[PDB]
Design a binder for this molecule. Sequence first.
Ligand SMILES: COc1ccc(F)c(C[C@@H]2CCc3c(C(C)C)nc(N)n3C2)c1
Length: 355
Amino acid sequence: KYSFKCVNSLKEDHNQPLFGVQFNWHSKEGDPLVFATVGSNRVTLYECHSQGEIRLLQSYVDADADENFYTCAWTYDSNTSHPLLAVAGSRGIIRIINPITMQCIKHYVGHGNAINELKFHPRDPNLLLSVSKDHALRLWNIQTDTLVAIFGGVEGHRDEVLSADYDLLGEKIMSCGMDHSLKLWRINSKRMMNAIKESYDYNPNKTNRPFISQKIHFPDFSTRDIHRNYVDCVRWLGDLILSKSCENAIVCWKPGKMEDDIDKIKPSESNVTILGRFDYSQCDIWYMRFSMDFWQKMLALGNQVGKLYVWDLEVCTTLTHHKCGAAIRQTSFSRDSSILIAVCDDASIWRWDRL
Ligand SMILES: COc1ccc(F)c(C[C@@H]2CCc3c(C(C)C)nc(N)n3C2)c1
């Protein structure tokens, strides 16, 4: 059903892989569609214009040349509506950047180990989730600069956490990593809702107390039975999960037996139910993300030879350009799903417009 035309492409002059791309879904009405790209020590902003024009807006060039940005996530200021961009990578430093000036206005350091993904809470623009090479997830309140919670320990991830996703309402997180496992962490518990509330009440200039972070050691569910390799991308599709490894499939599955409710699932739940698989080829290298559009009506995944697969989630289109031959690391749909951006290993950017 869905068709796209390649209207433009470009290459960033650093020639390093671009690991992340995100459209700003908080962009204002009347303003051009903006997306950010991340790779090497750079964060770059582009505007989408008519006649397929991809206009370079601005760039952040990190002071440390050895920084490798792996992820970016947009949010907005809850009082003014002004957009902000969160970036992080190999250095383990979260940077909150003002996109108008490219000023780093806030930075956070957990233990300083590489951050593989950032995600903002779907209902709270101040709640930032980070997943790290150090096997833990961290939840930050960027309004009060507090570490709300650390998810991990011997019962948490036993290797790098590579991806995570909040559900629709931001009541729970599903995480995944190098340990082959997918873990559930409920954040609508009395303990977590209280912690989030206290994070808002914290002001270090009016007290001598440190802000106490929750140490969440036990996940609400765990499975190692979906994939047989590094699980590098996870996303909620309602109460269901979409996840992939490097085994040439995106698996749609759920914790428990076929008719088990996600909110009745106990931590000891030993079963999983696979609902289906999105099969494809030549996407067996590690660290390849899939994306969905805002409405979760489309699913897109680039492969390691520059093909871009798009599935209709309501019922497969293959987007290919004879000059697009590098690994597509991540894709991003604009909020209205009219544009799909693919970023590559060779620092190239490809613009596909929906017909
Ligand atoms: C684009 O798709 C991603 C999926 C998952 C994911 F974690 C990332 C970010 C990094 C990409 C690079 C990286 C390495 C290098 C040193 C070999 N090693 C780890 N662990 N990474 C992860 C990206």
